[PDB]
């Protein structure tokens, strides 16, 4: 089956449950994890909830886990297709890091966007240059699509 | 009279055989007493084993005791598999970081990881052989 | 291991962005907000020397939610006589068309377009009347 | 009659010593069997003691030295000794103590000294007395 490290990540999850975050095994495959992660407190994403989805390569470790938000979400480094643009699943991955690593730093780019990324989405640049109206989109569609 | 004095001496015996079924109770209580004590050691030097096992000598890669241990420049260990996979990608420690100007195999660690897993159930010895013969086919 | 469906599709996305071969096919979403990656835009570029030559065919291709294991749904959107095509729907009838009746979990959007213009180019097929360039189904 | 009487009397504490000893000859071999238990006991144990005791003693003793290796470093034949003592043996030799291969590259190892002071944490505090006087002595000369 599996290797040591991804049974014991599992169990770690099931066994020891990041807060604010539920992480639950797909009926059919081992290596895919459905996950949902409540908006941070005191973001404009507080009171949603959010599904994710994790699939872990067969060179994971070596290979970073794939993560995308299956939620429609407001945030300058998810694109419109939920893609995540964030360095430790790309440029700074290291075997180390593990699944709920990368899980809470997901759920802390929604505690602290970074609309300064070069490769943002283009609800970047409205968060740059109108901050305001942008937190406030973001808690709209919060509203719209992550409150069922 | 000879008659109640035979019956004197029997019983006497009696009761000296009495006191020397006691005597061999009491024995065999310390002896059990002992085998508990015995039981109770053994139980604990597989923890001291338990040790090593779980927390020092594992590959943060893969999470297995070391197969091949080899150590970095930076003083980090891997498993030869693992860090030879990770170098295909990137030529930095995958804990420090740091750039990769050396690795060294360590005999102490292998012969130390070794020597522990004898001790082990059947089932742990087996892995690790299967894990062993897993990655030679790799090579 | 097997790839869950919306990581594969999304292998697809960026497949069809950088575009394969001669890039007589194509593919991409049709809606480029659709999170469930269902629905895909197909193009075929008719091959030479058939009648569908100089052509370029759109199509509709649907990945359900058992998609790679299950095939897609594929219709011809542009106009076109061809087995396996139904004349005035434009839906591919899967057990008409190889790849798709005897469908594999390896395959893909990219494999399903390359099988019906190699089709195209089948002796049934290249020498059917095609009808006016321009048209589509409903 | 009370002759007769006697006679019986002393027949049946016969029969109850008889009985007696039968129970005492049961015991000894209970006793006996308890004996061999813990004899298989014991070497079960052994083994155990005398992997600690090569442990400890052949994998994580400086050669040099003859202590637990202080700040483990590993050379490119995969030998390890203390980082004071192949320091002092390379002011004279650069072949390895063990080996003789010529001395090409060393590096300190974080794994080995976070294993041995595991390991000494669960030894005597006579012995884990010493490892500390010898660190600092040892730092002391650094
Ligand atoms: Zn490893
Ligand atoms: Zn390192
Ligand atoms: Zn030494
Ligand atoms: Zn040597």
């Known amino acids: 089956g599996l290797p040591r490290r991804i049974i014991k990540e599992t169990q770690r999850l099931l066994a020891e449950p990041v807060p604010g975050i539920k992480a639950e095994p797909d009926e059919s495959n081992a290596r895919y994890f459905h996950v949902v992660i409540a908006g941070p407190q005191d973001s404009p994403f507080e009171g949603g909830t959010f599904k994710l989805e994790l699939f872990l390569p067969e060179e994971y470790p070596m290979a970073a886990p794939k993560v995308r938000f299956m939620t429609k979400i407001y945030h300058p480094n998810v694109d419109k297709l939920g893609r995540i643009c964030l360095d430790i699943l790309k440029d700074k991955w290291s075997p180390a890091l593990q699944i709920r690593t990368v899980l809470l730093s997901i759920q802390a780019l929604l505690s602290a966007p970074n609309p300064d990324d070069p490769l943002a989405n283009d609800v970047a640049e409205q968060w740059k240059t109108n901050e305001a109206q942008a937190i406030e989109t973001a808690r709209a569609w919060t509203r719209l699509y992550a409150m069922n | ?139 | ?138």
Not at chain 2, 16 to 33: G, P, S, V
Not at chain 3, 4 to 18: A, D, I, M
């Open chain 2, 1 to 139: 009279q000879e008659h109640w004095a035979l019956m004197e001496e029997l019983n006497r015996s009696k009761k000296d055989f009495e006191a020397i079924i006691q005597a061999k109770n009491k024995e065999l209580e310390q002896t059990k007493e002992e085998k508990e004590k015995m039981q109770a050691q053994k139980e604990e030097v597989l923890s001291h084993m338990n040790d090593v096992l779980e927390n020092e000598l594992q590959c943060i890669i893969c999470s297995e005791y070391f197969i091949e241990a080899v150590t970095l420049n930076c003083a980090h260990s891997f498993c030869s598999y693992c860090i030879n996979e990770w170098m295909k990608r990137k030529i930095e420690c995958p804990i420090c970081r740091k750039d990769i100007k050396s690795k060294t195999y360590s005999l102490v660690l292998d012969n130390c990881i070794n020597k522990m897993v004898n001790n082990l159930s059947s089932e742990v010895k087996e892995r690790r052989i299967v894990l062993i013969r897993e990655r030679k086919a790799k090579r």
């Open chain 3, 1 to 138: 291991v097997k790839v869950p469906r919306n990581f594969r599709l999304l292998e697809e996305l960026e497949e069809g962005q950088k575009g394969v071969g001669d890039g007589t096919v194509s593919w991409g979403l049709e809606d480029d907000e659709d999170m469930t990656l269902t629905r895909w835009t197909g193009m075929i570029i008719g091959p030479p020397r058939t009648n569908y030559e100089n052509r370029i065919y759109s199509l509709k291709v649907e990945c359900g939610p058992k998609y790679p294991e299950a095939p897609p749904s594929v219709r011809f959107v542009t106009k076109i006589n061809m087995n396996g095509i139904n004349n005035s729907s434009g839906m591919v009838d899967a057990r008409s068309i190889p790849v798709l009746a005897k469908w594999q979990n390896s395959y893909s959007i990219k494999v399903v377009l390359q099988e019906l213009r190699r089709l195209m180019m089948s002796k049934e097929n290249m020498k059917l009347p095609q009808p006016p360039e321009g048209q589509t189904y409903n």
